[PDB]
Design a protein around this ligand. Structure first.
Ligand SMILES: CC(C)CNC(=O)[C@H](C)NC[C@H](Cc1ccccc1)NC(=O)c1cc(C(=O)N[C@H](C)c2ccc(F)cc2)cc(N(C)S(C)(=O)=O)c1
Length: 375
């Protein structure tokens, strides 16, 4: 047992519909399951009945609730909600041993946001103030945590894929959650968790595109997004290469577009016929990079008997690269805000087989990496 042991295994997920942590709000206590989202910056909770919600926040029952008397609307790439701003006392029972007064958006209405059977009732936006709604004056939860307490300005995520689980370690790192070394990439700018991808490989074969393409118009680490999302040009090249590498079997075009599922008899999935995928990220030293490598076990996601049905979970984007659960489920990911960097190591819980494993390797030599970023 390490010092952060009480924060280990503090995440859950139902049928692969998002990773959530328990958060306790108000006085007396109201505990709710809250989606961990590194892709946004608002802390918001269901605050009225909804067909997909088992519980919700009841502000009338919280003595410590303070109304900010201001509405808020947050649209995501998927779904949207509207609500009312306030502040209240917040603790994470399997998180840090502190209690803070944080901004909280009470969700009163929503569209395609909550997910049937997911078992979560709110969202914890862990990114920076720049992308907070209504604006950057609304202090995000982690900012309040760091300002009000002595909790170090760092958190880390281990998302364990396939009911699923994992760990959110707040204020530090737990060594039981990874193997090998942690490799760090700079946070390019503090808004989203923006990174820079400098090279892409399918089964070790370079995709051979300008690195500007991989980061057009940004690349982000986003635990709230299921897929590995890629800019259109990059997605097209990637799929063409993955098909070529997996050519012993043929699949319909709709499979590669995520519109069609393919199922195998329970336990017989031919993982071996599908390629590994590597992303190279800018390192902490000049002209130095490293690479992270995922398996089909990460990018082919299981979907709801004696058949294992899978969705191809790499998809196209018009708003830059999104390194979502498909990436994060291979790795222990350290969000080192204090040092403006993100670390990756091989996850102790990542799904693999007897022939291949997810990997984090380096260093590599990559020139002109500062040119890869969109301006
Ligand atoms: C700055 C902000 C105003 C906006 N920020 C964003 O929209 C960023 C880019 N994404 C975070 C935003 C947060 C969110 C939306 C809706 C429900 C739950 C969470 N995510 C998406 O836009 C999004 C979600 C999802 C999603 O289904 N998420 C669930 C909860 C999930 C997460 C992790 C898992 F391992 C499994 C399931 C999917 C997408 N895609 C567009 S997709 C299909 O993965 O490519 C996009």
């Amino acid at each position: 047992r390490g010092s952060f042991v009480e924060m280990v295994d503090n995440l859950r997920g139902k049928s692969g519909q998002g990773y959530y942590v328990e958060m306790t709000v108000g006085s007396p206590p109201q505990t709710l399951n809250i989606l961990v989202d590194t892709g946004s910056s608002n802390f918001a909770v269901g605050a009225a009945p909804h067909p997909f919600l088992h519980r919700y926040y009841q502000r009338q029952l919280s003595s410590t609730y303070r109304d900010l008397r201001k509405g808020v609307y947050v649209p995501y790439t998927q779904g949207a909600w509207a609500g009312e701003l306030g502040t209240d006392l917040v603790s994470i029972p399997h998180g840090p041993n502190v209690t803070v007064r944080a901004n909280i958006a009470a969700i009163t209405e929503s569209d395609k946001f909550f997910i049937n059977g997911s078992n979560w009732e709110g969202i914890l936006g862990l990114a920076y103030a720049e992308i907070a709604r209504p604006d950057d004056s609304l202090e995000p939860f982690f900012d309040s945590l760091v300002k009000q307490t002595h909790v170090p300005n760092l958190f880390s995520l281990q998302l364990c894929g396939a009911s699923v689980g994992g760990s959110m370690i707040i204020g530090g790192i737990d060594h039981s959650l990874y193997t090998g070394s942690l490799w760090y990439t700079p946070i390019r700018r503090e808004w989203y968790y923006e990174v820079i991808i400098v090279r892409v490989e399918i089964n070790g074969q370079d995709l051979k595109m300008d690195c500007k393409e991989y980061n057009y118009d940004k690349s982000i680490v986003d635990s709230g997004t299921t897929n590995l999302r890629l800019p259109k040009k990059v997605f097209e090249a990637a799929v063409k290469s993955i098909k070529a590498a997996s050519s012993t079997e043929k699949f319909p075009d709709g499979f590669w577009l995520g519109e069609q599922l393919v199922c195998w008899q329970a336990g017989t999935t031919p993982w071996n016929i599908f390629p590994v995928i590597s992303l190279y990220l800018m390192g902490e030293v000049t002209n130095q990079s490293f690479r992270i490598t995922i398996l089909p076990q990460q990018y082919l996601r299981p979907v709801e008997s004696q058949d294992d049905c899978y969705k191809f979970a790499i998809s196209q984007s018009s708003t830059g690269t999104v390194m979502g659960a498909v990436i994060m489920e291979g790795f222990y990911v350290v969000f080192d805000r204090a040092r403006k960097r993100i670390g990756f190591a091989v996850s102790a819980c990542h799904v693999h087989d007897e022939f291949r494993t997810a990997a984090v390797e380096g260093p590599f030599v990559t020139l002109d990496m500062e040119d890869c970023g969109y301006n």
